[PDB]
Amino acid sequence: LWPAPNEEQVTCLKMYFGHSSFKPVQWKVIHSVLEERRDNVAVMATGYGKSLCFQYPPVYVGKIGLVISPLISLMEDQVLQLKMSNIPACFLGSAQSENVLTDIKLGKYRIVYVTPEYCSGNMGLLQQLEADIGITLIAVDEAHCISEWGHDFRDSFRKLGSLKTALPMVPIVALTATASSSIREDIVRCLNLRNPQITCTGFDRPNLYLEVRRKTGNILQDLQPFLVKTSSHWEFEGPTIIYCPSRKMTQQVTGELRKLNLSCGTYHAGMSFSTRKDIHHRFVRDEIQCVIATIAFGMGINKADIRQVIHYGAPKDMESYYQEIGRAGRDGLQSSCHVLWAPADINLNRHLLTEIRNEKFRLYKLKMMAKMEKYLHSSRCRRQIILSHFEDKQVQKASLGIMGTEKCCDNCRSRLDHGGRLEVL
Ligand SMILES: Nc1ncnc2c1ncn2[C@@H]1O[C@H](COP(=O)(O)OP(=O)(O)O)[C@@H](O)[C@H]1O
Ligand SMILES: [Cl-]
C-alpha cells in the first residue's frame, strides 16, 4: 500500500498549508512524486485539493516545482495565495525582469508558474535550474490539451514531449478532469511518461443538491423562489453564484437584482488582478451576497460557504457544468445547484453551430448539446448521469449513499414524494 506521512511531512503541511492531514488521493500522488520519484496522472474532482499535489513537494524539500498551465490569471491568483501562506512563488514569462531570472537561478522561488509556450522556448534555463537548484516535479495542468480527443487541444502542449528528454530525472504530474482512458493514453504518450501512477478521486459532491427547472419568462419571477424577505428588504437565502452564458445576460440579471437592492458583483474573464482581489474580498466577507459570473475559476469566486449555485440558462456542457457547480459547498455543508433553462437557450441552439469551421469540433458541440439537453430533460437521477460522464462508464445508482435520497436531486426527491422506495438494504 502507501506508508503514512511522517511527522516532518505533516508539520510542513500544517505550517505552510494550514491542513491537519492529507486527503487520501493527495497523499498517494505526493508520496509517489516526492518519495518514489514517479510520474503521475491524477484525476481530481472539484474542490478536492489538486494544487496541494504540486505545491507541497517543492516546499517540503526546499527546491523548485515547475507548474505549466495556459491559465495565466489563475497562476497569478495562485502566486498570491502562496505568498499569503509564506511560500515564495512567481509567474515566469518573457516580460519578466532580468533580476527575477537571477532570483529563480538562486532558488528564491519554491513554485515557478510558466505557460506551455514559455516552457518550450527555455529548456536551457530549466536544465540550469535542474543542475543548480534541482526540480522536484513538473506539473502539467489541463494536460488533456495535449490530446486531440481531449477536445481542448493546444498545439502549445505538443512540444512538452521534450520535457522528459531534457530533464529525464524529473517526475511529471499530469492533472486531468476526467478518468477517460483515451485521454489518459494520449497524456502518457505525448508527455513520454514512464510507468505512471494513475489515481482518481471520484467525482461525487454529496452535499450538493441538484435541481433543474424551466424558465418562466421573466428574470425576477425565475429568481424569486431563491429570495427571502427579511423585514425591510429582499435577500438571497445564502451566498450565491449565478452563472450566465454571456456578458449580455449577466447585465440583464444584474439589472433585475438591483431593482431589489440586492448586493451583487459580476465576474468575467479579463478582469484585472486588483479587480479579482476586490471581488474576492467582498464575497468572502459577505459584503456582496451574489456573484453573477461568466467564468468558473479564479480567486473572485473562491469562497468556502457558497450555499446556492444557479445556472441562469442551460450550461455549456457537462464538464463546464460540473466545474461551475463545484464552486459550491466547499465547507461540506448542504448547498443547492439549480439550472434554469429553456429550449431556446443559446447553449442549446444548434443553429448557431452552422458557422463553426472544424467538423470534428462541431460534431463535439453537437454531441455535447445533445447530452446536456438529455440531462436537462431527464426524469432519472441527475447525480448518476453526471457521475457516469466523469467516470466514463455507467455508474450504478446506490454505489453511493447520497443517491436516491431526498437530498440527492429533484428527480429522486420527486420519486420519493410520489410513494417511492428508500433503499434500506
Ligand atoms: N489536505 C487538505 N485538508 C483540508 N482541505 C484541503 C486539503 N487540501 C486542499 N484543501 C482545500 O480544498 C479546497 C480546494 O482546493 P483547490 O486547489 O481549489 O482544489 P481544486 O483546484 O482541486 O478545486 C481548498 O479549500 C483547499 O484549502
Ligand atoms: Cl441562454
Could you walk me through the main structural features you see in this protein, from its secondary elements to its overall organization?
With 425 residues, the protein is an alpha/beta fold. Helices cover 39% and strands 16% of the residues. It has helices at residues 7-17, 24-34, 50-61, 72-84, 98-105, 116-120, 123-132, 155-158, 162-166, 181-190, 219-223, 247-259, 273-284, 318-325, 359-377, 382-391, 410-417; strands at 40-43, 64-68, 89-91, 111-114, 135-140, 172-176, 197-200, 208-214, 227-230, 233-236, 240-243, 264-267, 290-293, 308-312, 335-341. It binds adenosine-5'-diphosphate (ADP) and chloride ion.
How are the SSEs placed, and which strands pair?
Blueprint: H1 7-17, H2 24-34, E1 40-43, H3 50-61, E2 64-68, H4 72-84, E3 89-91, H5 98-105, E4 111-114, H6 116-120, H7 123-132, E5 135-140, H8 155-158, H9 162-166, E6 172-176, H10 181-190, E7 197-200, E8 208-214, H11 219-223, E9 227-230, E10 233-236, E11 240-243, H12 247-259, E12 264-267, H13 273-284, E13 290-293, E14 308-312, H14 318-325, E15 335-341, H15 359-377, H16 382-391, H17 410-417
Parallel strand pairs: 1-6, 1-7, 2-4, 2-5, 3-4, 5-6, 8-15, 11-13, 11-14, 12-13, 14-15
Antiparallel strand pairs: 9-10
Helix pairs in contact: 1-3, 2-3
The chain binds adenosine-5'-diphosphate and chloride ion.
PDB class: hydrolase
Keywords: hydrolase, DNA helicase, werner syndrome, RecQ protein-like 2, ATP-dependent helicase, Bifunctional 3'-5' exonuclease/ATP-dependent helicase, WRN Werner syndrome protein, RecQ-like type 3
Assembly: monomeric
